[PDB]
Amino acid sequence: HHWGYGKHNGPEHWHKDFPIAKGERQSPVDIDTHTAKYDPSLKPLSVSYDQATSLRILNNGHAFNVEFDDSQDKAVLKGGPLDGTYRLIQFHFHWGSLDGQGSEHTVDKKKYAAELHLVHWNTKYGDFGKAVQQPDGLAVLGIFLKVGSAKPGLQKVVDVLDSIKTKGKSADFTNFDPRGLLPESLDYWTYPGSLTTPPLLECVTWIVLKEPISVSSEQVLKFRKLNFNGEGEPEELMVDNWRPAQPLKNRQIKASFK
Template sequence: MSQRSLTWGYNKDNGPHTWYKHFPIARGKQQSPIDIQIWNAKFDSSLKPLNFNYSASTTRRIVNKGHSFEVEFDSSTDKSVLSGGPLTEKYKLTQLHFHWGRRDEEGSEHSIDDLKYASELHMVHWNTKYSTVSESIHQPDGLAVVAIFLKVGGAHQELEKITHALGSIRKKNMSTVFTNFNPACLLPDNKDYWTYSGSLTVPPLLECVTWIVLKEPINISKEQLSKFRSLYSTMEGEHPKKHIETNCRPRQSLQGRVIRSNLI
C-alpha cells in the first residue's frame, strides 16, 4: 500500500478539508458531490431511458476498504452492463458501495435543493471502449456512476443480504465471498434522473465521472444503517479501534457546470 493511500480519511486530521494537500485536483472545476438545485436543472429531450442489464452471476465478494465497504463484480464479461441515458457507450459494473453519516438524516453526499438523505449508494461502471478500469479512470468519460438515495423507513429486504454479510468483514481489509446477488434489486421503480460531469468523491478525486443521480430513493431501516456504522476503519490488531462513523465528502461548487435531466 502506498504512503499516499494512508493519508486520507474522514477524521479531523485527514478529512476532506485536507485532501487537497496530497490530491490538488480536490480544488478542480468538476468536483463531486454537488447540490442539485431543481430550478437550475435543464430538461434535455435528447436524454434516453437508462438500460440496466445486470446478472447475479457477476457478483464475487464483499470487502471492507477501511473507509467504506464494496461489493465487487466480475467485469470481464458483458453480463452486468449499463447503457442509455446520457451515455454513448456501454459501461460494465465493477463495484458498488455506500456513503453514510453520523446521523440518519444526513448521510448522502449529493443533495436535492439542500435536502440530504440517510445514505447514498454508488454503482460504479467503467467505459467498455477502454481496456481496463485503471485505464478508464484517467479519461473524462471513463466512469459512469449511478447514485441512489436511501431514506429511513422499513427494512429493505434485498439490502438485508448485504448487511448480513457485514458481520464477516468487520475490520479493514477483511473480505468474504458474496455471490448470487443481482444489484438490480436495489434500483427504485422510477428511474428518472439528473446527470452532470463530475469526479470521484474519494481520492484520487479524478474528474472522470458521468454522474447519474436517480430521483426516487429506496428504503433503509435504522437497524440496517447501524450495521454500516458497526464496521471498523482499523485492521485486526490495530489500536485504538475506530468505527466508520461517516464517509461523506461535503458538496462541491458547481463551477458553471450544467445539470441535465429527463424530468419535465
C-alpha cells in the same frame, strides 16, 4: 498520515496530496431541482443487471465494496446521457453517524441517510484502470437511501458485514443481485464530475436517481458498526464517510424528467 474522513485527514485536507480536489468538475454537488433543466434529448437509462456476477465484499478502510466479475460483458449501464457501454465493477455506500446526514449529493440542500454508488467503466478503454484516466471513463449510478421500510434486497449485504468488520477483511459474496437495490423509477439528474474520494479523478458521468430507496433503521445501524481501523487497532466506527457538496463551477445539471 493517509487520507480519511477525520478532523486531521478529512475532505478539507485532501487537496494537499490531491490538488485536483479544487478542480473544475469535482463531486459531489448540491442538485438545485429548480435550476436543473429538463433535457428532452436525454434517453431512458438502460440498466441490464440480469447476468451480474458478484464475487466478493471488501472493507477497504473507507467503505465496503461489493465487487463483480467484469471479465465478460454482463452487467451494463447504457443510454441515458452515455455514449457506448459501461460495465459494472463494484458498488458501495456512503452513510452518516445519524439518519440526518450521510449522502454525498444533496437535493435542494437535503441530506439523505446514505447514498449507494454503482460504479461502471467505459468498455472502449479496455479496463477499469485505463478508463479512470479519461474524462468519460466511468459512469456512477447514485441512489439515495432514506430510513423507513426495510429493503429486502439489501439484507444479504447487511448480514455479511459482521465478517468484514475491519479494514482489509474480505468475504466471498457470490450470486448477489443488485436489481434488488433499485427504486421503481429511473428518472435521473446527470452532470460531469469526479470520484468523491482520493484520487478525485475527473473521469465520471454522474447519474443520480430522483427516487430514493427505503432501508430500515436496523439496516443502516449495521453499516454504522463497521470499523475504519484494521483488526487489533483502536476502534473507529465507520460513519460519516461522505464528502460534502463541492462548487458546481462551470457545469449544468440536466434532468431526464419534467
